Design goal:
The structure is a homodimer. By secondary structure, chain A is an all-alpha fold. Chain A folds into two domains: 1-54, no CATH class; 55-102, Winged helix-like DNA-binding domain superfamily/Winged helix DNA-binding domain (Arc Repressor Mutant, subunit A), CATH 1.10.10. Helices cover 70% and strands 0% of the residues of chain A. Chain A has six helices and no strands. In chain A, helix 1 crosses helix 3 and helix 2 runs antiparallel to helix 3 (43-51). Chain A is elongated and about 45 Å long. The A-B interface holds A 23-24, 26, 30-31, 33-34, 37-38, 66-67, 69-73, 86, 88 and B 19-20, 22, 26-27, 29-30, 33-34, 62-63, 65-69, 82, 84. Chain A: Residues 9-52, 56-101 form the Putative host cell surface-exposed lipoprotein Ltp-like HTH region domain.
Chain lengths: 102, 98
Amino acid sequence: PEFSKVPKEYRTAVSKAKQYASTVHMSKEELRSQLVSFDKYSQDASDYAVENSGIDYNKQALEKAKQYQDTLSMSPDAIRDQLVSFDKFTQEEADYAVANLK
Amino acid sequence: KVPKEYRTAVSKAKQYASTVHMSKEELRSQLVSFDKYSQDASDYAVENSGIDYNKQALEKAKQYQDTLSMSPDAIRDQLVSFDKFTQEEADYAVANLK
């Protein structure tokens, strides 16, 4: 749905989604839950924001993967499972993240 | 009295405490592996940046609760087992969840 025909709330949710993605490295599902649970956006505004904020979730997975590697010295395989099972990144996002680790 | 690099490590440590919310042990490792500080500069920074690790545990507890819809008890275990916060930091964090 085009940006100009969308409620103000959806545009504010997009602004908030961009803030979260630039600071905390969330998967689409983590961000979807954050916008509803913390910011109190409706499910529809959150669902719109996670898809329409220009977020590259492969890059989000890579940044989270680097954090796990640097803060905890977790193995690439342990990081891949954590990103999928726990953070709820897709398998392809987690595979891309770990292929770009040290 | 302290080297410039110890003071920039403190300034870097404060940046993580305002946006990322790492435990002392996660931050100690981060400053070395990611930021390329010496182990001595990192060990100094994690203790001398005025960081409240109780507050860091609470901020990280809120992230788990809202991003993953985690229960208070699952968050408590996660903060200790995964994040390496102390038990006292994790107990404070969970007691302060709404």
